[PDB]
């Protein structure tokens, strides 16, 4: 079983610019572990598999959260640290194009459809239970949990938004944008590390190590 109520409860329980962005990311990594443990059945998975899932998904999971958080923000994002980062500040820091991708492909789409917190929570749980993650001891178990999440989300959408029959598909179709943006932000982080001017804290550093 995978009730959306527990997923929603998980979301509610955890509620230059590049430097400030990296601080927030590190900060939210601690919070993410807490979120994942509150997602039904995650803690019962083998510890090694919990490690694989969080290492595979952390970036996408964190991007989804700050994007939804930014829905009331005009042309900007709200960091978990309380900092509002505007589009102009991103451009003038050399990361304008990727910043705009987040705004147009994620934040704005979440805003235009009024994506709610149960929906965000489900999409994140789906991202968490990624059966393509390399090294898993039982991908079939993870797949099964993913299927349960999206069965519940679909039922939740049919019930809460019956006048929007395409809503469920619309939600799932933000996941390719998220994947792509996650991979681009990670590329940037590796570069910030390489150049060596940007402070990168310990949990963020550990995510950047090889498996």
């Amino acid at each position: 079983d995978m009730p959306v109520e527990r997923i929603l409860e998980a979301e509610l329980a955890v509620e230059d610019p590049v430097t400030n962005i990296c601080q927030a990311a590190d900060k939210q990594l601690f919070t993410l572990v807490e979120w994942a443990k509150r997602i039904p059945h995650f803690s019962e998975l083998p510890l090694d598999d919990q490690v694989i899932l969080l290492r595979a998904g952390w970036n996408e999971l964190l991007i989804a959260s700050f994007s939804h958080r930014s829905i009331a923000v005009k042309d900007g994002i709200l960091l978990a640290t309380g900092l509002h980062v505007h589009r102009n500040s991103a451009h003038s820091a050399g990361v304008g194009a990727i910043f705009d991708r987040v705004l147009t492909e994620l934040v704005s789409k979440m805003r235009d459809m009024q994506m709610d917190k149960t929906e965000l929570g489900c999409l994140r749980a789906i991202v968490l239970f990624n059966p393509d993650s390399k090294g898993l001891s039982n991908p079939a178990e993870v797949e099964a949990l993913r299927e349960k999440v999206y069965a519940s989300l679909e039922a939740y959408c049919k019930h809460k938004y019956p006048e929007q029959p395409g809503r469920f598909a619309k939600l799932l179709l933000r996941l390719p944008a998220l994947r792509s943006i996650g991979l681009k932000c990670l590329e940037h982080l590796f570069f910030f590390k390489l150049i060596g001017d940007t402070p990168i804290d310990t949990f963020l550093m550990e995510m950047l190590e090889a498996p």
């Binding site: 572990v33 510890l47 919990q50 969080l54 290492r55």
Partner: peptide, 10 residues
């Protein structure tokens, strides 16, 4: 991956 292991442990 010491930090993650430690936090998942509890």
């Amino acid at each position: 991956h010491k930090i993650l292991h430690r936090l998942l442990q509890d």
